[model samples]
Target: MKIHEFGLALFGEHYSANQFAKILINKDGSNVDRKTIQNWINRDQDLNDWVIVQLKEELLKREVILKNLLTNLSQA
Candidate 1:
C-alpha cells in the first residue's frame, strides 16, 4: 500500500458508509444508516464533489485529534 491513489477513503479513513452513518447519529439527534450514505455515493454526482468534500472535512477533523498527521506536507 505504498504506491497508489486511494482517492476513495470509505473504509481507509474509518468513514465508510456504515461508519459514517454512525457519525451522523449525533448530527441532529436523528438516525442515519449505511445504505443512506451508500446510496448517496452511488448517486455518481461527480468526482471531488459532495462526497469528497465531506471526506476532506471529516479527514481534517480527525487530523486535528489523531496524531499521525501527514499530508503531502512534502509538496515542495
Candidate 2:
C-alpha cells in the first residue's frame, strides 16, 4: 500500500511520521533521512497525493469487507 496507509495500519494515530522513520531504521538496520520523510509529508505534493490514493484504496477494500460481513450477520 501507500506510505501513509501503511503508516496508519502499522502504527495507528498515536505515532508520528518521525517515529515511523525511526522504527524503519531500527527494524531494517538502515539509515533513513528524516528530512526526506518530512519532505514527503510537507513539501512534496506529488508524493503526498500518490500516498493518499494508495491508502484510500487499501482502506476502502478493508471497509468493504467489514461491511459485507456485517450484512451477512444481519441476514443470518
Candidate 3:
C-alpha cells in the first residue's frame, strides 16, 4: 500500500497526527514526528519496511480480536 493510504488505514478519518507519531518508531530506531506523517499524506512517500511490518502486525492483531469476539458470539 502507498504511504498516504497507510496513513488513512492506520489513523482513520479523524486522528491526531502528532499523537500517533509519538508512538511510531522508525526503522532507524528514531521516533517519528507529525511532519513525517504529513509527508506521507502530502507526498505519498514510500513506507519503511518496519512500518509495513507493523501495519501487518496491527492487522493480524485486529483479526485475532475479531475472531475471539465471533467465538464468544457463537457461544452466546
lDDT of 1 by residue, 9-69 (tens): 4346444556666555434667666786676566733433544455567667776755444
Which parts of model 1 are misplaced by more than 4 Å? 1-10, 13-15, 26-28, 46-57, 68-76
Per TM-score, what order, best first?
3, 1, 2
Model 2 residue 40 lDDT?
A: 61
Q: Which lDDT tens digits does candidate 3 get at residues 1-76? A: 5554554555666655574586577768888778877777677667778777866776677678878999889955
Q: Which pairs of residues collide in candidate 1?
A: none
TM-score against truth, every candidate: 0.44, 0.41, 0.61
lDDT of 2 by residue, 1-76 (tens): 2365466665576646675465434225565566766766565334445445544665677688878899889955
Best by TM-score: 3
- Each prediction's RMSD over C-alphas, in Å, is 8.0, 7.0, 3.0
**Cα-based lDDT for every prediction:** 0.51, 0.58, 0.70
Number of backbone collisions per candidate:
0, 0, 0
lDDT of 3 at 42: 71
Model 3: lDDT equals 0.70
